[PDB]
Design a protein around this ligand. Structure first.
Ligand SMILES: N[C@@H](CCC(=O)NO)C(=O)O
Length: 158
């Protein structure tokens, strides 16, 4: 029940804990783009931070709904982030699809920063995930990888 919910705090890059700022910094440098002060980063409670003050952040709790027939995945909190499982994302991309994948990978235990940028950590996690589940390990999230992520993170699905 509780293992399908991803809770934590949303920070802006300027407000984020320094360990999170450095992770985001290195992530943006890998995709050769500059981080901006208003970049959102979601830090799950499972993440090991020594001296994190939640006051600078905003609490959020995410769950996943995968509509197989509609080929869509919805990330649910107070807001609803929906993406098409026909979209292909890979290292270098940034946006809501990347965020959705990061949230799902984090629920399955992968260590990726949830900042909407597909850098090296996301790539490694995707390859690992693909190897674990018998998918081609090309590091690209396409239809087959979205489907597997969706089935594993939506509790109503087998
Ligand atoms: N890894 C992809 C394979 C299809 C694709 O877009 N390749 O570039 C998937 O998960 O379907």
């Amino acid at each position: 029940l509780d293992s399908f919910t991803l809770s934590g705090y949303i920070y802006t890059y300027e407000n984020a804990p320094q360990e999170i700022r450095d992770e985001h910094k290195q992530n943006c440098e890998e995709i050769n783009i500059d981080p901006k002060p208003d970049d959102e980063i979601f830090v799950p409670e499972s993440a090991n931070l020594m001296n994190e003050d939640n006051s600078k952040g905003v609490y959020a709790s995410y769950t996943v709904s995968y509509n197989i027939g509609a080929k869509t995945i919805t990330i649910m909190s107070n807001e609803y982030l929906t993406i098409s499982t026909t979209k292909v994302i890979r290292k270098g991309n940034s946006g809501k699809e990347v965020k959705a994948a990061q949230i799902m990978l984090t629920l399955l235990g992968y260590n990726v920063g949830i900042d909407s940028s597909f850098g090296s950590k996301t790539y490694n996690a995707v390859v690992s995930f693909q190897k674990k589940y018998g998918l081609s390990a090309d590091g690209i999230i396409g239809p087959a990888t979205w489907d597997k992520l969706g089935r594993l993170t939506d509790p109503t699905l087998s």
